[PDB]
Symmetry: D2
């Protein structure tokens, strides 16, 4: 459901995710991180399944944030891959990958992996 996803969400670290789910399966919005070499809002773009299953299955989605805005550039990008689970307590459960640009030599230590859970607050 696009409307289900559309809104303001927050995760356990205190980050803000403002997203709009478009009818063609598009996701656009802004991300505000509570951690890292990150200041202010960052543009996010993603995709979700706009025709999910009619049973109790989550809606698959994913989005990317490149950590560069007009104030900072961390030379890194995070992709979140997960599912939206609707109900009274709507959640987005994700696993993420954070890759930093590196020299060829340090490429083996370029990617962090973790997981985030988002709770919806507003539309």
């Amino acid at each position: 459901a696009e409307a289900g996803i559309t809104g303001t969400w927050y995760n356990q670290l205190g980050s803000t995710f403002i997203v709009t789910a478009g009818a063609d399966g598009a996701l656009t919005g802004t991300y505000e991180s509570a951690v890292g070499n990150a200041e202010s809002r960052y543009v996010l773009t993603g995709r979700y399944d706009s025709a999910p299953a009619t049973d109790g299955s989550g809606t698959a989605l994913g989005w990317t944030v490149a950590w560069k805005n007009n104030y900072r550039n961390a030379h890194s990008a995070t992709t979140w891959s997960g599912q939206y689970v609707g109900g009274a307590e709507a959640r987005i459960n994700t696993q993420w990958l954070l890759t930093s640009g590196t020299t060829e030599a340090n490429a083996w230590k370029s990617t962090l992996v973790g997981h985030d859970t988002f709770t919806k607050v507003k539309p």
Copy 2:
């Protein structure tokens, strides 16, 4: 480096990805996979660092593909996170996460992880 991300790339599995990199960090294009519950092209959208470091570092990027098009709906989405390295042989080294929408019961087994390397060859 420079507009070099724009182009048609191919990975080890025969998948093709056509992308346009916008001056300000946007990535847009299509993806056509050769594996999984996939048939035809799919829209892709992502972001990349449009001001990378001057030292010899790669360009951080990432993109998403929801596997639903007019033909098929696999109820899943893959995100690729990596970095582009230009030169005589430009390549995009990535790690990816593929999440399938599941019931809560099967949520523990909802995400696959792998790696793909793309070249313009």
Copy 3:
């Protein structure tokens, strides 16, 4: 601390992890999973940092379970990588990789990734 780690632990899915931390950095014990093509106990082996930092840092560790015992064989193995955090509420926070043996053709869909949190019950 070996004694801190040694004991009975359980995670959010209802699985049991019985482990002994040896003085040389070794971990041995048994795992009982509440999910998958898994029945009864399985042998686990792992390693942990037996000389961790004197500040509030967790203790790094990891272990493997090959899902084959005398009753079942799932042809798969899981490795858990994480940290032990001591206190009154001792936890082991992990991220895991589950690889299934596959044909070359299906190798791209051989590995699942997830995360588990363990709470200690007994010594």
Copy 4:
């Protein structure tokens, strides 16, 4: 397949791993890395499927290395999860997780993920 996992393997980064595979699924040996806060050999322990499927499937395995030896202590541990494929050119394809002990504050950035391919060459 068979006792073929036993041996000395090498990965793309120059690391060497010497392993003995026990009849019942145990893996024991040493690892010597060429990258990170590492100096000399480290003990490794793991498990593998000692009764793999007869169809053309790989042998599931995994092992752990805590990065502490008599010389160095990096306060970290890496786990590799993958599968062995025998043949004219045997190889072990793996994905790994490297966790560093951190304060709670930095727990979000405690784990690196990558992939390594080992051959006997």
